Amino acid sequence: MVPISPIETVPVKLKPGMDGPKVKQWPLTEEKIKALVEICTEMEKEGKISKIGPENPYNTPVFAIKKKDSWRKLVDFRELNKRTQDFWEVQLGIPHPAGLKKKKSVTVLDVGDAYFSVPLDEDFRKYTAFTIPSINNETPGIRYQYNVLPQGWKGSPAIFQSSMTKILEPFAAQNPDIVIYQYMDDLYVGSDLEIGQHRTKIEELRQHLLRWGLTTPDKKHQKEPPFLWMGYELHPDKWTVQPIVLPEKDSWTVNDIQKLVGKLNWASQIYPGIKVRQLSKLLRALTEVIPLTEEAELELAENREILKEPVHGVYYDPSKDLIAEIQKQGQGQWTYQIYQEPFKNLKTGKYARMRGAHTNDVKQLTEAVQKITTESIVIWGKTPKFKLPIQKETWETWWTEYWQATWIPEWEFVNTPPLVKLWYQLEKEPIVGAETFYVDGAANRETKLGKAGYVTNKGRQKVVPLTNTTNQKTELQAIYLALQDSGLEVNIVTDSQYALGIIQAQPDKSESELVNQIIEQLIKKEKVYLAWVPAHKGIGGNEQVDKLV
């Protein structure tokens, strides 16, 4: 007998104040009971379980399920899981193919044997107790408890991975010419070694695993490239998403679009130029059929054009530079590609604007850059160089005059329309020679009736009456009137902190049709100076009296 090393057990406890499961064992057919007894007899013979006396008060329901009409044992650990402590789950966040490195050889080994070589904490085994009902309920049912990590239990996947990692750790550290990764019951080893050396390293690994009594099926594993893994397709020199098929339908329900958006969202990480807004603006009742707008139908038609052919992403090469390029798609949609060599994307992606009342392209661009930056640190551990559709001069003007602090990491201008620009720019000082418009708005809170208008230094005046409106709309309306009736240069004086707060935010697009009209007016102007004064302070010009009525 060759001495094998024990595997360190992990101290498991129940949540504070709680106790183990006490669930009644369900009555089983004589057919199923016979099946379970045989199974648990050899499991005991393998050391996976053990018979326990009447002392144990804990119980967990065990079922028997016909393995596709051929018996399988199924212990329902749902009650124990709710009462088991929280673990440090390590799978949280799967690797992304774009961050991996190409391998000449990637071998797979089965780790179904090593699972039952991981023992459970001695003081916790009692909580895993279950009963095999007796035939006709005429004897005390057979009581068992687990000795190894039970299938289905809360702590099993975490303890298994941490135990496997701890074993593979010296092998990985001493063999830096290979890479090892674990995916549920299977081990994946990759290397760029000469194939001869590669087969040996696998055997060394198998020999290393033997120290803990872990045997691989000593055979050439059927699994070979390409690998189907977490929705991806892994090839030795490239990667892609598992085939995206857009279904042909005359009737789309709420659920169908969710299936459509989800696939489009998933495919957007390698298929460039994927749009989803006009299909996401329909899900604003999964069986309810929703009519697809003409604007959305044209988007789906463009989607099928992009999903026409398979596209592949390359792997990461640490010796080269990392580049991210962004393009504006319109309607608050942005798309990007990340590459090292031209026309060879590591991955792609998209960004959608946040739900707000007002917004501009420069802000969205910044948000996209930050998202990509955060994603790129996760995947590659560094920040890509950016190629942006915005002039250097435009960015400088923006951030040196913006009230908030803002920053874009190292980037260059790429001239691929539609370019991002500033549409209007307010003056810092009053304009000499320009007509001065004192504007004001007011509305009766009850009748919803209100007035808006202005007075000027040249004697120009206007007051318009308005129905179905608020104080905030009439304040905005007043500014719009001044813009309409003024020349290319104009000074506007308002007491509305609300209006100022909006225009100081500098939107180029908005939900409110009122604000949009103002923006279209600002754009047409050569110079606009906005000035604020407090209300009701008897500041002449500020003519509340024309709107108070």
Partner 1 sequence: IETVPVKLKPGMDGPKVKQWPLTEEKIKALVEICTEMEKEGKISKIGPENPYNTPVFAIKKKDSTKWRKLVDFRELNKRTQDFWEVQLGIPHPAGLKKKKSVTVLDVGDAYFSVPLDEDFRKYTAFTIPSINNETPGIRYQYNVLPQGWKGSPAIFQSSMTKILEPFKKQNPDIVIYQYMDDLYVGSDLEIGQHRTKIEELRQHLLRWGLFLWMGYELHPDKWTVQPIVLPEKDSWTVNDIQKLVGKLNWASQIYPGIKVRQLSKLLRGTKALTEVIPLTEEAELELAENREILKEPVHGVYYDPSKDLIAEIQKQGQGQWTYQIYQEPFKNLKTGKYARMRGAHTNDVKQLTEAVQKITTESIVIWGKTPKFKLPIQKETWETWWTEYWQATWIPEWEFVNTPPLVKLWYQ
* Residue ranges of the binding site for Mg(2+): 110, 185-186, 440, 475, 495, 546
Instruction: Indicate which of ligand 9W3, partner 1, none lies near residue 539 (CB less than 5 to 8 Å, by partner kind).
Output: partner 1
The DSSP bridge pattern shows strands 186-191 and 72-75 to be unpaired
Establish how many alpha carbons lie within 13 A of residue 269's alpha carbon, considering only the half-sphere containing its beta carbon: 20
Tell me which of partner 1, ligand 9W3, none is bound by residue 374, counting a contact when its beta carbon lies within the kind-specific cut-off of 5 to 8 angstroms. partner 1
Of these partners, ligand 9W3, partner 1, none, which one is at the site of residue 155 (CB under 5 to 8 Å by kind)?
Answer: partner 1
Q: Which does 418 bind (CB under 5 to 8 A by kind): ligand 9W3, partner 1, none?
A: none
DSSP state of 418: S
The contacts of residue 463 (CB under 8 Å, 6+ apart) are 451, 452, 453, 546, 547
What is the residue whose two structure tokens read 């039970």? 150
The DSSP code for 133 is P
| Three state DSSP letters for 68-88 | CCCCEEEECCHHHHHCECCCC
Q: Which is nearer to ligand 9W3, 178 or 323 (CB)?
A: 178
Cβ 16 to partner 1 shortest distance, Å? 9
Provide the token pair at 259: 């299936």
The residue whose two tokens read 């991210």 is 324
411 binds, among partner 1, ligand 9W3, none (CB under 5 to 8 A by kind): none
Q: Which is nearer to ligand 9W3, 190 or 453 (CB)?
A: 190
Residues that bind ligand 9W3 (CB under 6 A): 95, 100-103, 106, 176, 179, 181, 183, 188, 190, 225, 227, 229, 234-236, 315
Nearest approach in angstroms of CB 201 to ligand 9W3 is 12
C-beta closer to partner 1: residue 219 or 536:
536
Residue with token string 């110079």: 527
Nearer to partner 1, 335 or 366 (CB): 366
Nearer to ligand 9W3, 193 or 414 (CB): 193
Pairing mode, strands 72-75 and 62-65: antiparallel
Closest to 227 in 3D by CA, of 100, 347, 317? 100
CB of residue 128 vs ligand 9W3: minimum separation in angstroms?
31
Return binding residues: 110, 185-186, 440, 475, 495, 546
Among partner 1, ligand 9W3, none, what binds residue 524 when CB lies within 5 to 8 Å by partner kind? none
Distance of CA 435 to the CA centre of its chain: 52
| Residues paired with residue 130 on neighbouring β-strands, in sequence order | 60, 144
CB of 100 to partner 1, least distance (A): 7
406 binds, options ligand 9W3, partner 1, none, Cβ within 5 to 8 A by partner type: partner 1
Contact status, residue 178 vs residue 171, Cβ threshold 8 Å: no
What minimum distance in Å lies between the beta carbon of 169 and ligand 9W3? 15
Whole-angstrom distance, CA of residue 437 vs CA of residue 430: 12
Identify which of residues 64 and 455 has a Cβ nearer to partner 1 in the complex. 455
- Residue 236 interacts, among partner 1, ligand 9W3, none and using kind-specific CB cut-offs from 5 to 8 Å, with ligand 9W3
**CA 344/CA 103 separation, integer angstroms:** 18
Cβ proximity to ligand 9W3: between 116 and 183 the closer is: 183
Task: Tell me the three-class secondary structure of 32-82, residue by residue.
Answer: HHHHHHHHHHHHHHHCCEEECCCCCCCEECEEEECCCCCCEEEECCHHHHH
Tell me the closest approach of the beta carbon of residue 104 to ligand 9W3, in angstroms: 9
CB of 390 to partner 1, least distance (A): 16
User: Is 342 strand, coil or helix?
Assistant: coil
Structure tokens at 68: 């596709």
H-only helix segments in 220-338: 254-267, 277-280, 294-306
**Beta carbons of 419 and 462 less than 8 angstroms apart:** no
Q: Which C-beta is closer to ligand 9W3: that of 122 or that of 317?
A: 317
The CA distance from 232 to 63, in Å, is: 34
In angstroms, give the least distance from the CB of 71 to partner 1: 32
Nearer to ligand 9W3, 228 or 523 (CB): 228
Residue 84: both structure tokens together:
């088991």
Selection from ligand 9W3, partner 1, none that 308 binds (CB < 5 to 8 A by kind) is none
Query: What is the nearest approach in angstroms of ligand 9W3 to the Cβ of residue 410?
Result: 25
- Omega prior to 389 cis, within 30 of 0: no
